[PDB]
Symmetry: C2
Subunit: 364 residues, 2 copies
């Protein structure tokens, strides 16, 4: 009888390859949590009970037992969506059968959306609406570059979907966070964007304008930019003069806001740059520069290295005086010798690096 | 009471990366069989009972249930070797405990050895020898380049191991196929390989000269070279005017010896080049050129393409008029459009290729 939701995660994770080989794309950590745990937490803030995960391939990719978060938080994942090759309609194909006597509209979310997540949508748009909160929109500067403009007139109702419009109809873009009523479910074998054109034809499709940030985290560059946009929004959310985290293992300075895992050891004279994240049990040397970069799980970092606009693996062991900058992702259990300069090179897991790379490329 | 053996497979498979992500390095197919099946068949030709596999990392890497070959052939794998970080002594660390009351000397083999496999070694060197067939040697043209020369005098006994010798002591090189007696087992905590200097100190180490080919299959280039040396040695082994395989689905011509899986379909006017292998259910177009290349498992190939000195994935789907040459390895479930020219580029699994690449490199 409790409120339920569906999350569309079906994909391969090909774009974010260099660090998705070890763990699936949904559960690659962002800031300090797996990429989906943010959405489960927001849906709990709504007050949902269980989440319907829609995986296109490898449903038993070790995710079931890796989901330790399932026992906590009082949220149970069923993993009931196994997809044969059909159209791009998750709920229509598999989740239509499983409803278990719902009573409230169920949310629909992507896996690469990062926002302030306004969780009043169940209560909002309740003023005698059929299919409340049917679509969610946000402002974009490039009205024509992204395309797919959802025109929102003065009335909170949408009637036309135009792709690459010549007219300046509006700056609204489909955020990808949907909520539909139970009656929406209709058996449509493979399908036109989940019957959105008809949904507007009966004129029961509403849009919610979003003031917060929005972007698709599908690439490492988008990963870094999402980090730099999302960190300032967490000032009232989590625990962490710039006092985001100042004294952990020694008297070190932080230029801007950053997320420092309490179990980590920063060192003595490190300079944690703006919008940086550090995972548990991470060790940072006596003097370091973590500038707009993420350090995930148990990693060791020597003395004097600079990690700028980059990521490191899970059990990665970084040299002492190296210099890692630009958009370069290091896979799992990588090791780099002293005094190496990796500039925008993605290394495969378990590799070893001992030579300079001044140009973008891949190390196998 | 039956004869047993130990296979050292402990490794990462890093060198043969682009096609070892899907399946572990020991079970990447060679010609028509997994790389361990040749070893197991030779050891059966000896008459062994069980094989002790020594895997360094990920013992349960889905190999146990994927080893369908265990139920057949009447050979049982125990997978009892899980390795904590110690020295390079597999049998001394774990396999020392498990002997199961042996009565005959047990073989020790690598995983990247390809030879004629003389399986009379149990009977050979039995003329009152202690530790019969302690080492195996083969001729190499580059006496000093490879180094580690095992000097074999007129007597079948070795007394000195010299690394990078200045003197032309001999062309023998340690093949890596060992057989030791039960009494050899001595608890040596981390380890001069198998205590070879002492083994020569008591002077009971013998060498067997090999007339056949020998090379380590650790790289795709070495993979191709090993295939082109090993195919002619199978003329008396398996089922397949050049009549290695001439008429399967149409009247096609084969220039040299090749391995054509019976379930495959060749087409109508293909030209299967010298020393090529094709897996089961593979489909080859109307006119093709498979020149010194390996096609693994279910693959589709269009019309007029050329696969020269290359490998393709498991479920690979190849375009019609493409041109794949040089040492290029295609991962699992890759797809290439029509008229692409991949020259020595390794693609990652599940990727898609639609653009030319005239230089060596990697596609993510």
């Amino acid at each position: 009888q409790g409120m339920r939701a569906v999350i569309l995660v079906g994909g391969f994770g090909t774009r974010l390859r260099p660090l998705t080989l070890t763990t699936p794309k949904p559960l690659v950590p962002f800031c300090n949590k797996p990429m989906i745990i943010h959405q489960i937490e927001a849906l709990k803030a709504v007050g949902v009970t269980e989440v319907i995960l829609a995986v296109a391939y490898r449903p038993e990719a070790m995710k079931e037992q890796m989901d330790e978060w399932s026992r906590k938080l009082g949220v149970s994942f069923v993993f009931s969506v196994e997809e044969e090759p059909l159209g791009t309609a998750g709920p229509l194909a598999l989740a239509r059968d499983i409803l278990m006597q719902d009573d409230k509209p169920f949310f629909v979310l992507n896996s690469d959306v990062t926002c302030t997540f306004p969780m009043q949508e169940l209560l909002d748009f309740h003023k005698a609406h059929g299919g409340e909160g049917t679509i969610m929109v946000s402002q974009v500067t490039q009205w024509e570059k992204y395309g797919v403009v959802v025109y929102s007139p003065q009335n909170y109702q949408i009637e036309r979907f135009v792709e690459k419009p010549s007219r300046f109809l509006g700056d609204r873009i489909n955020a990808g966070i949907y909520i539909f009523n139970k009656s929406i479910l209709d058996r449509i074998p493979p399908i036109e964007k989940e019957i959105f054109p008809a949904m507007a034809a009966e004129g029961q499709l509403y849009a919610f304008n979003l003031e917060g940030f929005w972007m698709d985290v599908g690439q490492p560059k988008d990963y870094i930019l999402g980090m730099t946009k999302f960190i300032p929004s967490l000032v009232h959310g989590n625990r962490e003069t710039e006092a985001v985290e100042h004294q952990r293992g020694g008297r070190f300075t932080v230029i801007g806001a950053s997320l420092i895992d309490p179990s980590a050891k920063i060192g003595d004279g490190a300079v944690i740059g703006p919008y940086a994240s550090i995972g548990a049990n991470c060790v940072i040397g006596e003097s370091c520069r973590i500038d707009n970069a993420a350090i995930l799980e148990n990693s060791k970092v020597g003395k004097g290295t600079m990690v700028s606009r980059s990521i490191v693996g899970w059990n990665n062991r970084i040299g002492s005086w190296c210099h890692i900058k630009d958009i370069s992702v290091l896979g799992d259990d990588v090791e780099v010798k002293d005094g190496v300069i990796l500039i925008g090179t993605k290394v495969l897991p378990n590799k070893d690096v001992g030579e300079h790379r001044f140009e973008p490329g891949i190390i196998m």
